Amino acid sequence: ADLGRKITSALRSLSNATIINEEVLNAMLKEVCTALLEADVNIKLVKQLRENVKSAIDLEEMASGLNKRKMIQHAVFKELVKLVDPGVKAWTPTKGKQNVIMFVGLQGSGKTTTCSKLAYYYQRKGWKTCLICADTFRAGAFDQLKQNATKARIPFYGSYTEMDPVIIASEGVEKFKNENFEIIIVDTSGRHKQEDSLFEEMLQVANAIQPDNIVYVMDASIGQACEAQAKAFKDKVDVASVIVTKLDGHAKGGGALSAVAATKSPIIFIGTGEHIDDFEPFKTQPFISKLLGMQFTLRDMYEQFQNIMKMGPFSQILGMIPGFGTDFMSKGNEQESMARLKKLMTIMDSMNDQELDSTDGAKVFSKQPGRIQRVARGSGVSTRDVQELLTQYTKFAQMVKKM
RNA sequence: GGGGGACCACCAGGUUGCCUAAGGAGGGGUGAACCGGCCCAGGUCGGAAACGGAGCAGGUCAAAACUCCCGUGCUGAUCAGUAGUUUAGCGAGACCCCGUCUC
């Protein structure tokens, strides 16, 4: 979210000036290239983007009569497309039946986190996922995967110390082909801080099973050293994809994105932190756009809050829409405003059908002050917080019936 | 957490009356608004945890209080007028005819 501010500052530097000449475009691209280099992005490819922008739109030829800065922002957006993502969306849905997808990461790339949290989105969309943990050389990560996975009702077939990921993955697939499942995600192990050594075993697994998709997990902390690895990743398996993880902990994600774009592949999923909810599919060009340029009852409010928290996760889509304004994007590192909503929902759950189905619950609570005091017995929140909720509901209903 | 006393309200259920014009050891419901108990999701408090406390939704009633019905005794009142019994006459009159007389 820093690169968008740095290029929005470059757009504000284009605006509010009465110059327009080649020097302003030069000084703006001098600030754009500085922002890309401070991300990580390679000065050769950035100067290639710059000379492509100049060869596309010079200012020596006269397209006489022209609204400016709009097609300039569009050309900068277009060249940042023609480098970050190769175009239209990478194919996210569930690819037919039984969906055998392989995952190979790196040591320290949050293999357990990615392989745990990718299943929740397909389970919420309505697709049955099954994880085969062939992480044979990580006995502790077996226990972390099981402790994080038993809260999600997922079957598991895999034992300890068989030393054969081929046999473990094959017996996993042939046992999850029993109850007619749909997605089979196979999580393979780590070795040697992988030089050239696990790809032989992964070719053995692929020759044994013949999977459908192969997705490799990459980090944002590596930066411009992703290229030599990605050459091997895209020469050994052609039909394969990337998941770039760990964005909020580093300032070097754009360099990894530029390395993947220079090695010419589309990216399906992306990770944005350590929490469960920090994964997003790719809406490629609108990600770059959102980055650069931005009778009502108590039961009715409770059900609308149910619908809003049902549209809950969704934060990179719902929070980056034009028309919001400045002074946001942190709100105290984004946690408590989503957390207190469930608390207010339980304060509303401390009400009965009469209070929730009456016409004006604030008027009913003003007529009967013991109804305010009855919420505090079962919600356990303070009566002051109940009264603050009722004043917020009163102002809310006033803004609704005036709205 | 382990134990010794003292007091209040009630229930089951066995004997009962210095008790009634009658006083069921009946059934049901709310148990709300903080004022009965139990199980207590989520949450909160204490704790490093195990776990435990106050306990909300929700469910529950042999045992806080309230209320309804049946039975009960007093008590007005309604219904069918059911029940088993209680003109005529007289005296005068015009003209004509018949005789007499005179000129």
How far apart, in whole angstroms, are the C-alpha atoms of residue A65 and residue A68?
9
How far apart, in whole angstroms, are the C-alpha atoms of residue A33 and residue A330?
26
A3 CB-near residues (< 8 Å, 6+ apart): A35, A36, A39, A254, A291, A292
Tell me which residue of A256, A257, A216 sits closest to A237, measured CA to CA: A216
C-beta separation of A159 from A178 below 8 A: no
A40 CB-near residues (< 8 Å, 6+ apart): A223, A224, A252, A254, A255, A256, A258
How far apart, in whole angstroms, are the C-alpha atoms of residue A221 and residue A230?
15
Tell me which residue of A142, A128, A135, A238 sits closest to A184, measured CA to CA: A128
> How far apart, in Å, do the first and last CA atoms of chain A sit?
33
How far apart, in whole angstroms, are the C-alpha atoms of residue A173 and residue A155?
12
Question: Which nucleotide does the CA of A380 lie closest to, via C1'?
Answer: B44
For the sheet containing A129-134, what is the strand order? Answer: A129-134, A183-188, A100-104, A213-219, A241-245, A267-271, A279-281
Q: Which residues get their CB within 7 angstroms of nucleic chain B?
A: A 342-343, 345-347, 349-354, 368, 370-371, 373-375, 377-381
Nucleotides of B under 7 A from a protein CB: 32-35, 41-45, 53-58
Q: Round to a whole number and report the distance in Å from the CA of A213 to the C1' of B70.
A: 79
Tell me which residue of A30, A82, A24, A93 sits closest to A52, measured CA to CA: A82
Tell me which residue of A85, A83, A23, A32 sits closest to A59, measured CA to CA: A23
CA dihedral A112, A118, A198, A202 (to 10 degrees): 140
The encoded tokens of residue A371 equal: 């109804």
Resolution value (Å, 1 decimal):
3.7
E strand or H helix at A132, and its extent? strand A129-134
The encoded tokens of residue A259 equal: 């390395």
Tokens 């280099």 locate to A37
Specify binding-site residues of A for GTP.
Answer: 105-112, 187-191, 245-248
List A49's β-bridge partners, or say none.
none
C-beta separation of A256 from A216 below 8 A: no
Structure solved via:
cryo-EM
E strand or H helix at A183, and its extent? strand A183-188
Query: Exposed, middle or buried: residue A75 (CB in 10 Å: 0-12, 13-18, 19+)?
Result: middle
Query: Exposed, middle or buried: residue A402 (CB in 10 Å: 0-12, 13-18, 19+)?
Result: exposed
The encoded tokens of residue A297 equal: 């009852």
The encoded tokens of residue A120 equal: 């929740």
C-beta separation of A345 from A389 below 8 A: no
Largest Cα–Cα distance in chain A? 78
Q: Round to a whole number and report the distance in Å from the CA of A140 to the C1' of B48.
A: 23
C-beta separation of A149 from A124 below 8 A: no
DSSP A355: H
Backbone angles phi, psi at A281, to 5 degrees: -75, 175
Question: Which nucleotide does the CA of A378 lie closest to, via C1'?
Answer: B56
Tell me which residue of A15, A215, A24 sits closest to A102, measured CA to CA: A215
Query: Exposed, middle or buried: residue A139 (CB in 10 Å: 0-12, 13-18, 19+)?
Result: exposed
Instruction: Give helix A253-262 / helix A227-236 axis angle, nearest 10°.
Output: 40
